[PDB]
Design a protein around this ligand. Structure first.
Ligand SMILES: [Mg+2]
Ligand SMILES: [Mg+2]
Ligand SMILES: [Mg+2]
Ligand SMILES: [Mg+2]
Ligand SMILES: [Mg+2]
Ligand SMILES: [Mg+2]
Ligand SMILES: [Mg+2]
Ligand SMILES: [Mg+2]
Ligand SMILES: [Mg+2]
Ligand SMILES: [Mg+2]
Ligand SMILES: [Mg+2]
Ligand SMILES: [Mg+2]
Ligand SMILES: [Mg+2]
Ligand SMILES: [Mg+2]
Ligand SMILES: [Mg+2]
Ligand SMILES: [Mg+2]
Ligand SMILES: [Mg+2]
Ligand SMILES: [Mg+2]
Ligand SMILES: [Mg+2]
Ligand SMILES: [Mg+2]
Ligand SMILES: [Mg+2]
Ligand SMILES: [Mg+2]
Ligand SMILES: [Mg+2]
Ligand SMILES: [Mg+2]
Ligand SMILES: [Mg+2]
Ligand SMILES: [Mg+2]
Ligand SMILES: [Mg+2]
Ligand SMILES: [Mg+2]
Ligand SMILES: [Mg+2]
Ligand SMILES: [Mg+2]
Ligand SMILES: [Mg+2]
Ligand SMILES: [Mg+2]
Ligand SMILES: [Mg+2]
Ligand SMILES: [Mg+2]
Ligand SMILES: [Mg+2]
Ligand SMILES: [Mg+2]
Ligand SMILES: [Mg+2]
Ligand SMILES: [Mg+2]
Ligand SMILES: [Mg+2]
Ligand SMILES: [Mg+2]
Ligand SMILES: [Mg+2]
Ligand SMILES: [Mg+2]
Ligand SMILES: [Mg+2]
Ligand SMILES: [Mg+2]
Ligand SMILES: [Mg+2]
Ligand SMILES: [Mg+2]
Ligand SMILES: [Mg+2]
Ligand SMILES: [Mg+2]
Ligand SMILES: [Mg+2]
Ligand SMILES: [Mg+2]
Ligand SMILES: [Mg+2]
Ligand SMILES: [Mg+2]
Ligand SMILES: [Mg+2]
Ligand SMILES: [Mg+2]
Ligand SMILES: [Mg+2]
Ligand SMILES: [Mg+2]
Ligand SMILES: [Mg+2]
Ligand SMILES: [Mg+2]
Ligand SMILES: [Mg+2]
Ligand SMILES: [Mg+2]
Ligand SMILES: [Mg+2]
Ligand SMILES: [Mg+2]
Ligand SMILES: [Mg+2]
Ligand SMILES: [Mg+2]
Ligand SMILES: [Mg+2]
Ligand SMILES: [Mg+2]
Ligand SMILES: [Mg+2]
Ligand SMILES: [Mg+2]
Ligand SMILES: [Mg+2]
Ligand SMILES: [Mg+2]
Ligand SMILES: [Mg+2]
Ligand SMILES: [Mg+2]
Ligand SMILES: [Mg+2]
Ligand SMILES: [Mg+2]
Ligand SMILES: [Mg+2]
Ligand SMILES: [Mg+2]
Ligand SMILES: [Mg+2]
Ligand SMILES: [Mg+2]
Ligand SMILES: [Mg+2]
Ligand SMILES: [Mg+2]
Ligand SMILES: [Mg+2]
Ligand SMILES: [Mg+2]
Ligand SMILES: [Mg+2]
Ligand SMILES: [Mg+2]
Ligand SMILES: [Mg+2]
Ligand SMILES: [Mg+2]
Ligand SMILES: [Mg+2]
Ligand SMILES: [Mg+2]
Ligand SMILES: [Mg+2]
Ligand SMILES: [Mg+2]
Ligand SMILES: [Mg+2]
Ligand SMILES: [Mg+2]
Ligand SMILES: [Mg+2]
Ligand SMILES: [Mg+2]
Ligand SMILES: [Mg+2]
Ligand SMILES: [Mg+2]
Ligand SMILES: [Mg+2]
Ligand SMILES: [Mg+2]
Ligand SMILES: [Mg+2]
Ligand SMILES: [Mg+2]
Ligand SMILES: [Mg+2]
Ligand SMILES: [Mg+2]
Ligand SMILES: [Mg+2]
Ligand SMILES: [Mg+2]
Ligand SMILES: [Mg+2]
Ligand SMILES: [Mg+2]
Ligand SMILES: [Mg+2]
Ligand SMILES: [Mg+2]
Ligand SMILES: [Mg+2]
Ligand SMILES: [Mg+2]
Ligand SMILES: [Mg+2]
Ligand SMILES: [Mg+2]
Ligand SMILES: [Mg+2]
Ligand SMILES: [Mg+2]
Ligand SMILES: [Mg+2]
Ligand SMILES: [Mg+2]
Ligand SMILES: [Mg+2]
Ligand SMILES: [Mg+2]
Ligand SMILES: [Mg+2]
Ligand SMILES: [Mg+2]
Ligand SMILES: [Mg+2]
Ligand SMILES: [Mg+2]
Ligand SMILES: [Mg+2]
Ligand SMILES: [Mg+2]
Ligand SMILES: [Mg+2]
Ligand SMILES: [Mg+2]
Ligand SMILES: [Mg+2]
Ligand SMILES: [Mg+2]
Ligand SMILES: [Mg+2]
Ligand SMILES: [Mg+2]
Ligand SMILES: [Mg+2]
Ligand SMILES: [Mg+2]
Ligand SMILES: [Mg+2]
Ligand SMILES: [Mg+2]
Ligand SMILES: [Mg+2]
Ligand SMILES: [Mg+2]
Ligand SMILES: [Mg+2]
Ligand SMILES: [Mg+2]
Ligand SMILES: [Mg+2]
Ligand SMILES: [Mg+2]
Ligand SMILES: [Mg+2]
Ligand SMILES: [Mg+2]
Ligand SMILES: [Mg+2]
Ligand SMILES: [Mg+2]
Ligand SMILES: [Mg+2]
Ligand SMILES: [Mg+2]
Ligand SMILES: [Mg+2]
Ligand SMILES: [Mg+2]
Ligand SMILES: [Mg+2]
Ligand SMILES: [Mg+2]
Ligand SMILES: [Mg+2]
Ligand SMILES: [Mg+2]
Ligand SMILES: [Mg+2]
Ligand SMILES: [Mg+2]
Ligand SMILES: [Mg+2]
Ligand SMILES: [Mg+2]
Ligand SMILES: [Mg+2]
Ligand SMILES: [Mg+2]
Ligand SMILES: [Mg+2]
Ligand SMILES: [Mg+2]
Ligand SMILES: [Mg+2]
Ligand SMILES: [Mg+2]
Ligand SMILES: [Mg+2]
Ligand SMILES: [Mg+2]
Ligand SMILES: [Mg+2]
Ligand SMILES: [Mg+2]
Ligand SMILES: [Mg+2]
Ligand SMILES: [Mg+2]
Ligand SMILES: [Mg+2]
Ligand SMILES: [Mg+2]
Ligand SMILES: [Mg+2]
Ligand SMILES: [Mg+2]
Ligand SMILES: [Mg+2]
Ligand SMILES: [Mg+2]
Ligand SMILES: [Mg+2]
Ligand SMILES: [Mg+2]
Ligand SMILES: [Mg+2]
Ligand SMILES: [Mg+2]
Ligand SMILES: [Mg+2]
Ligand SMILES: [Mg+2]
Ligand SMILES: [Mg+2]
Ligand SMILES: [Mg+2]
Ligand SMILES: [Mg+2]
Ligand SMILES: [Mg+2]
Ligand SMILES: [Mg+2]
Ligand SMILES: [Mg+2]
Ligand SMILES: [Mg+2]
Ligand SMILES: [Mg+2]
Ligand SMILES: [Mg+2]
Ligand SMILES: [Mg+2]
Ligand SMILES: [Mg+2]
Ligand SMILES: [Mg+2]
Ligand SMILES: [Mg+2]
Ligand SMILES: [Mg+2]
Lengths: 141, 59, 203, 110, 77
RNA sequence: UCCCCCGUGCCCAUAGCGGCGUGGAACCACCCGUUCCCAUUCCGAACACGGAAGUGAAACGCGCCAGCGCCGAUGGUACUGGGCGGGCGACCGCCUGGGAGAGUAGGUCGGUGCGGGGGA
RNA sequence: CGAUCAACGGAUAAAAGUUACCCCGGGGAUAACAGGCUGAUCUCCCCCGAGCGUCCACAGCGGCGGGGAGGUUUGGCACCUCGAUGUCGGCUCGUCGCAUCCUGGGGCUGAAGAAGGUCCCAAGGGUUGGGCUGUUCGCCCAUUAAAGCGGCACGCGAGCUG
RNA sequence: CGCCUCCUAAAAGGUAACGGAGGCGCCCAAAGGUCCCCUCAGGCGGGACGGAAAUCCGCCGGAGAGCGCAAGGGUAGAAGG
RNA sequence: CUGACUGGGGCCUGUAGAGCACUGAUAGGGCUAGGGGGCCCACCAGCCUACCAAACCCUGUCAAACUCCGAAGGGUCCCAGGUGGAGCCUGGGAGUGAGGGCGCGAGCGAUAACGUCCGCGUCCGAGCGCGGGAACAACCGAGACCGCCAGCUAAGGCCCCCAAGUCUGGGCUAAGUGGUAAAGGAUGUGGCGCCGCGAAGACAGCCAGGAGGUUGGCUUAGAAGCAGCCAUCCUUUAAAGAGUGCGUAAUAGCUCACUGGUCGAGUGGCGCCGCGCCGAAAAUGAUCGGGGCUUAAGCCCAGCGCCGAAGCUGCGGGUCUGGG
């Protein structure tokens, strides 16, 4: 599942989740989209569960585009140690996601299929979601 | 023209520069009124503490 | 077709006031004029969803003029997915650079075999006389196998319309489909821990 | 993308301007040799001299010297004494040296 | 459990010490810096560590000459 | 005071790259030589001297063209000094003042100072 | 000129350990018990519906993921108490919660019957005696309608034990 | 545990944590002063032994190379050779 | 008169935001060195790849230690306002060098802690004096010199406890929601919007029709619409998918989809907004502070009036300071 092949730094300070998404707000490849309604660190495992469920719905067919990527390392202190003695170990990777972002798109599939896969995928993600379909507003960006 | 400035909300709990602004205007007590020349430096402190003050144009 | 849309002028009205009352702020311009305008959003939206940036919109202005324009840019509110501003571009008799719809005529071989047509470009950029705007441009994809691809160079262009993007630019492709059969070789696929780029006497 | 000639010219000229003196700049063509004394504060030439303008003769070196002398004379006439020698892209040698030496005989201070 | 980190050096208090329009005397330091972020201009010296300073009494002025860099001048009084 | 050229500056790419054209009377260059001054980790390529048969091929100057490069609005938005609200929170909104970046329209194949030399 | 005076503003030219034989002065400025905040961990309940269940997603189950509740675990923190808040287990005596072990009522069942499973309602009462071990827990013997799980300063030492 | 560089550091300076990353405890008789000269990496094409890469020729190439050592700033109109 | 603070003007800055030109990360595609693999061969060269994939390009992104950009602000100097328990200079005397809550910006922690560690601000500390918040150092209001059986307000309030409206107008809620919670679930309710389908008579009901090829195949061991997919072809039709589910061991076995008669006016589906519903289990007796509240005594919008402090006013007094 998704993680950087290499990085300049092993650990990142946590930062903030303020604002609407910087970019990535319009459908850009496929026909239907899953857009984030609230901010979160989406984990690599959560992403992979969304993906796997979608290919599972399609059985064979369709194309899934994953548009968010987990490059933020997530740190945790070993169980039961006290505060201090330096930063915790990287235990996983997250993709920071703000409201408005198209996290996933699908193409090559019926409408009822794109809706359903995106719904099931939604249930794997720890935030609220909206399914969208490509508009002229998308195409003009 | 002149500015009649009235202190109507307490500066307790507001930043020290806003407390200083009242002092530049000569406002020490709530409800106190001061008539001040309407120049830009006076007007700047009056605007600084606008949320503490009532202004009225006179003469 | 070609669509009409009533437009109106704005001076110092606050954009937020406009939007609260259903009006979508915008601007119309070209090399000769530049005017602050607004349109009814629900009216704008109805046109735009068919018009897009692809087809001519004529602006019925309250001064009586009727200007032919292309929507040049539409600003979307990123939290809510709603237009918040439109740029109306006033066509004049010069040729104009613009986007013209592609139509992908045909059912690819690659698709019959289970593939998926990735419509990489759904439209194409083009210099052309306003008096010459094609409804679209057919492109035959029927010869496409997984995983063959078409480019703008392979586009057969209508009279008086000249490509405005590099012919080397890919426009469609036919790629392998999602397949459940691949999941296990994926789910058991052992991935190397990330390398950290060396600092200092390391490099 | 500059040339050795453009770099060299800069490299010597910059070092001269830094001292703030009036700049005696020398141009040396295949046939002629010219000289202007310039105030870089004002971006203005104050005094000139050329083989071209003096309709001078033959041996380039001797000619150089003469323009040197000519330069100085019009120069002291204007109150100019001190100045700094701008050999430009040219080695201090040959025609240029000769130009310098003449301006020196003429009483120009450098 | 421990850290291999933990260190840092003293801050060096770098930057401009006199801004445009400010009156200075000869010797006044005008800029403290690493390398040449500002170059010495008219009536301005540069010490070995790139420190810009006034050569004469006068007033400071800054100048941005595009690709030529930024300059500190002192214009006499 | 206008036009061309030669120097030398300033603005610091709206001045650049590329394509095309153009100039040798003057000037500049290439050029002709390497005795002489000077010179090549070898080379008269460079630097340097002495020249004046040729050529504007190279270079340079001056024009033109927007493929690239560079510049770039207006509108709207992000964000925000100050003042207010809301949410258990992650966070979200309102008032007043300020206001980007991206992008769109569009602009650009430089402008100008001083001094020389030539021409009207 | 002689400093890993490097514990790097460098106590002496010259210096390690141990104390359950211990002592004084202090500190709830600071640990161990308990409480408190938190709830990562713990226990319980949900969302999703891949898949299993001959057939059939949902009788019984629930991949990968997602949301919570509780405050019985192990911790984090260091907030009252170090001019003392006695600390495990047992005995005695209760009392409460209900996420119910039994008994009563019920729906579904892959419920023929009998017997089960699973969920729902229900806290009135009940919830045994023994071997081992200081044990709590647990295993075991013999029974039972059942041999519930938790809270009360891990309830209860001015009530006992030790 | 002293010293240096970056980040944290909220666009002046400063700013903590057993916060995130690295370095120093040397060196150079030139690796110093000055005068003069020179300009890189890299890409493509060409060339015996000769190769991804030795040296040579050509065109492109503003700095991505170099600058003794960490990092940063700086820098070819040189601080590089 | 130099101060805090303020006005104008210059200069400095690299954060918010953003961007991708650098350093790195990055999904997909294109192009294309390099391998893996398959044809064809060892005479050394070919060829093909739905394989992994460098550089480059396009679309689309990511960054404290990236920046082609880049605010609001901040700092500093100059002129000016500013006479204040301001400022500057010399000297005497200290105390403090355990802080703490809160708001905003970060780090650490787990986008935990009445957690921890910095920054800017505030308040408590020392304002455990006063009003509101049921009670409550730091939340809101407000800086208590003394006296008054006078007045106006602040936050918060005005049904009774309890001072002041059972005040006025518009709307929602039926859950005692209000008066503690999430994913998610739902013909709750009100209100907007968008699609189908209908008097060429729809939806409901009273009534029919659902058909041949055809038990089709890559198909195994049953696979006849109804166990994987890379099949959706047609005829007769008024209609009818080589089929929406119930069904079989495989059939057969029923309906929907879809067409005909009766009525005679709506009907079905999506989405959005407001307020509610479930999800909702903890330990001595309960409870929104209580009583009690339902066109409210709840929520939203718009008002007028009052009450309400040690704030402000009136009257009288004290002390210090300045001025007569
Ligand atoms: Mg997480
Ligand atoms: Mg973490
Ligand atoms: Mg830590
Ligand atoms: Mg950690
Ligand atoms: Mg993780
Ligand atoms: Mg985002
Ligand atoms: Mg979800
Ligand atoms: Mg974009
Ligand atoms: Mg106040
Ligand atoms: Mg006050
Ligand atoms: Mg307050
Ligand atoms: Mg303030
Ligand atoms: Mg007062
Ligand atoms: Mg260590
Ligand atoms: Mg550290
Ligand atoms: Mg320091
Ligand atoms: Mg420090
Ligand atoms: Mg530092
Ligand atoms: Mg500075
Ligand atoms: Mg020096
Ligand atoms: Mg030096
Ligand atoms: Mg200036
Ligand atoms: Mg100056
Ligand atoms: Mg010239
Ligand atoms: Mg010029
Ligand atoms: Mg000038
Ligand atoms: Mg020609
Ligand atoms: Mg030319
Ligand atoms: Mg000629
Ligand atoms: Mg001729
Ligand atoms: Mg010789
Ligand atoms: Mg001779
Ligand atoms: Mg020669
Ligand atoms: Mg000759
Ligand atoms: Mg030529
Ligand atoms: Mg030249
Ligand atoms: Mg722009
Ligand atoms: Mg603007
Ligand atoms: Mg604003
Ligand atoms: Mg604010
Ligand atoms: Mg504004
Ligand atoms: Mg900005
Ligand atoms: Mg802009
Ligand atoms: Mg033009
Ligand atoms: Mg140009
Ligand atoms: Mg001239
Ligand atoms: Mg010694
Ligand atoms: Mg020490
Ligand atoms: Mg010592
Ligand atoms: Mg120190
Ligand atoms: Mg000693
Ligand atoms: Mg000794
Ligand atoms: Mg010792
Ligand atoms: Mg010792
Ligand atoms: Mg001892
Ligand atoms: Mg002992
Ligand atoms: Mg013993
Ligand atoms: Mg003993
Ligand atoms: Mg003894
Ligand atoms: Mg003994
Ligand atoms: Mg003893
Ligand atoms: Mg003792
Ligand atoms: Mg304590
Ligand atoms: Mg301590
Ligand atoms: Mg303790
Ligand atoms: Mg303790
Ligand atoms: Mg404890
Ligand atoms: Mg206690
Ligand atoms: Mg919990
Ligand atoms: Mg909890
Ligand atoms: Mg639950
Ligand atoms: Mg099965
Ligand atoms: Mg079943
Ligand atoms: Mg299944
Ligand atoms: Mg279940
Ligand atoms: Mg699970
Ligand atoms: Mg969770
Ligand atoms: Mg859980
Ligand atoms: Mg507890
Ligand atoms: Mg709690
Ligand atoms: Mg603990
Ligand atoms: Mg605990
Ligand atoms: Mg404690
Ligand atoms: Mg503490
Ligand atoms: Mg104690
Ligand atoms: Mg006591
Ligand atoms: Mg005692
Ligand atoms: Mg006691
Ligand atoms: Mg009990
Ligand atoms: Mg129960
Ligand atoms: Mg029973
Ligand atoms: Mg039975
Ligand atoms: Mg049976
Ligand atoms: Mg049962
Ligand atoms: Mg019971
Ligand atoms: Mg009971
Ligand atoms: Mg019981
Ligand atoms: Mg026995
Ligand atoms: Mg026993
Ligand atoms: Mg036991
Ligand atoms: Mg045991
Ligand atoms: Mg029984
Ligand atoms: Mg027992
Ligand atoms: Mg106990
Ligand atoms: Mg406990
Ligand atoms: Mg107990
Ligand atoms: Mg006890
Ligand atoms: Mg006892
Ligand atoms: Mg006991
Ligand atoms: Mg007791
Ligand atoms: Mg006792
Ligand atoms: Mg007792
Ligand atoms: Mg007792
Ligand atoms: Mg007893
Ligand atoms: Mg004992
Ligand atoms: Mg040291
Ligand atoms: Mg800093
Ligand atoms: Mg900084
Ligand atoms: Mg700083
Ligand atoms: Mg700052
Ligand atoms: Mg300082
Ligand atoms: Mg440490
Ligand atoms: Mg070290
Ligand atoms: Mg040497
Ligand atoms: Mg050197
Ligand atoms: Mg040397
Ligand atoms: Mg090369
Ligand atoms: Mg080669
Ligand atoms: Mg070879
Ligand atoms: Mg080679
Ligand atoms: Mg470098
Ligand atoms: Mg090194
Ligand atoms: Mg004054
Ligand atoms: Mg001052
Ligand atoms: Mg001041
Ligand atoms: Mg100011
Ligand atoms: Mg940012
Ligand atoms: Mg980048
Ligand atoms: Mg781009
Ligand atoms: Mg960020
Ligand atoms: Mg930073
Ligand atoms: Mg940044
Ligand atoms: Mg300022
Ligand atoms: Mg300023
Ligand atoms: Mg003043
Ligand atoms: Mg005084
Ligand atoms: Mg004072
Ligand atoms: Mg004082
Ligand atoms: Mg005393
Ligand atoms: Mg002291
Ligand atoms: Mg003290
Ligand atoms: Mg201390
Ligand atoms: Mg301290
Ligand atoms: Mg403390
Ligand atoms: Mg403090
Ligand atoms: Mg502190
Ligand atoms: Mg508190
Ligand atoms: Mg704080
Ligand atoms: Mg707030
Ligand atoms: Mg904070
Ligand atoms: Mg920080
Ligand atoms: Mg943090
Ligand atoms: Mg959590
Ligand atoms: Mg704290
Ligand atoms: Mg906190
Ligand atoms: Mg915190
Ligand atoms: Mg504080
Ligand atoms: Mg104290
Ligand atoms: Mg207070
Ligand atoms: Mg105070
Ligand atoms: Mg008190
Ligand atoms: Mg109170
Ligand atoms: Mg109270
Ligand atoms: Mg009360
Ligand atoms: Mg208080
Ligand atoms: Mg007072
Ligand atoms: Mg009243
Ligand atoms: Mg009020
Ligand atoms: Mg009340
Ligand atoms: Mg009453
Ligand atoms: Mg009423
Ligand atoms: Mg209920
Ligand atoms: Mg209630
Ligand atoms: Mg309730
Ligand atoms: Mg509903
Ligand atoms: Mg609703
Ligand atoms: Mg509920
Ligand atoms: Mg009403
Ligand atoms: Mg009152
Ligand atoms: Mg009163
Ligand atoms: Mg008073
Ligand atoms: Mg009185
Ligand atoms: Mg008095
Ligand atoms: Mg006094």
């Amino acid at each position: 599942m998704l993680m950087p092949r290499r990085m300049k730094y092993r650990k990142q300070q946590r930062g903030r989740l303020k604002g609407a998404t910087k970019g990535g707000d319009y459908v850009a490849f496929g026909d239907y989209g899953l857009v984030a309604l609230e901010p979160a660190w989406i984990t690599a495992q959560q992403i992979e569960a969304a993906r796997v469920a979608m290919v599972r719905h399609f059985r064979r067919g369709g194309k899934i585009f994953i548009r968010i990527f987990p490059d933020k390392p997530y740190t945790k202190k070993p169980l039961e140690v006290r505060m201090g003695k330096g930063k915790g170990n990287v235990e996983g990777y997250v993709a920071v996601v703000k409201p408005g972002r198209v996290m996933f798109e699908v193409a090559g599939v019926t409408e009822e299929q794109a809706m359903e896969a995106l719904r099931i995928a939604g249930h794997k993600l720890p935030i609220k979601t909206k399914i969208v379909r490509r508009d002229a507003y998308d195409e003009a960006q | 023209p002149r500015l009649k400035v009235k202190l109507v909300k307490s500066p307790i709990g507001y930043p020290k520069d806003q407390k200083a602004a009242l002092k530049a205007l000569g406002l020490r007590r709530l409800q106190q009124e001061r008539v001040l020349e309407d120049t830009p430096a006076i007007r700047g402190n009056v605007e600084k503490v606008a949320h503490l003050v009532r202004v009225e144009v006179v003469e | 077709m070609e669509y009409r849309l009533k437009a109106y002028y704005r001076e110092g009205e606050k954009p937020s006031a406009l939007r609260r009352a259903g009006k979508l702020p915008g601007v119309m311009y070209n090399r000769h004029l530049n005017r602050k305008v607004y349109v009814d959003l629900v009216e704008f939206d109805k046109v735009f969803r068919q018009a897009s940036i692809h087809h001519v919109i004529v602006l019925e202005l309250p001064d009586g003029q009727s200007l032919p324009t292309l929507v040049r840019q539409v600003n979307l509110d990123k939290r809510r997915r709603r237009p918040e501003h439109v740029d109306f571009f006033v066509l004049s008799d010069e040729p104009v650079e613009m986007y013209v719809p592609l139509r992908f005529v045909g059912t690819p071989a690659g698709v019959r075999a289970g593939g998926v047509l990735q419509e990489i470009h759904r439209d194409i950029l083009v210099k052309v006389s306003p008096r010459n705007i094609p409804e679209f441009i057919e492109v035959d994809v029927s010869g496409l196998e997984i995983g063959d691809s078409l480019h703008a160079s392979d586009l057969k262009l209508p009279p008086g319309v000249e490509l405005a993007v590099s012919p080397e630019e890919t426009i469609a492709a036919v790629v392998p489909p999602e397949d459940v059969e691949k999941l296990a070789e994926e789910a058991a696929a052992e991935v190397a821990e990330p390398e950290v780029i060396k600092k200092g006497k390391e490099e | 993308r500059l040339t050795a000639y453009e770099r060299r010219k800069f490299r010597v000229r910059n070092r001269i301007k830094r001292t703030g003196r009036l700049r005696l700049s020398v141009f040396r063509s295949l046939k002629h040799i010219y000289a202007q004394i310039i105030d870089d504060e004002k971006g203005v030439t104050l005094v000139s001299a050329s083989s071209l303008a003096l309709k001078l003769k033959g041996n380039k070196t001797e000619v150089a010297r003469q323009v040197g002398r000519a330069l100085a004379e019009k120069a002291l006439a204007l109150g100019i004494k001190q100045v700094a020698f701008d050999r430009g892209p040219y080695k201090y040698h040959g025609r240029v040296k000769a130009l310098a030496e003449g301006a020196r005989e003429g009483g120009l201070e450098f | 459990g421990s850290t291999r980190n933990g260190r840092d050096s003293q801050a060096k208090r770098l930057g401009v010490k006199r801004y445009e329009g400010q009156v200075v005397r000869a010797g006044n330091i005008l800029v403290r810096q690493r390398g040449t972020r500002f170059k010495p201009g008219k009536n301005v010296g540069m010490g070995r560590d790139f420190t810009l300073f006034a050569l004469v009494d006068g007033v400071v002025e800054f100048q941005d000459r595009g690709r030529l860099g930024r300059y500190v001048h002192v214009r006499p009084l």
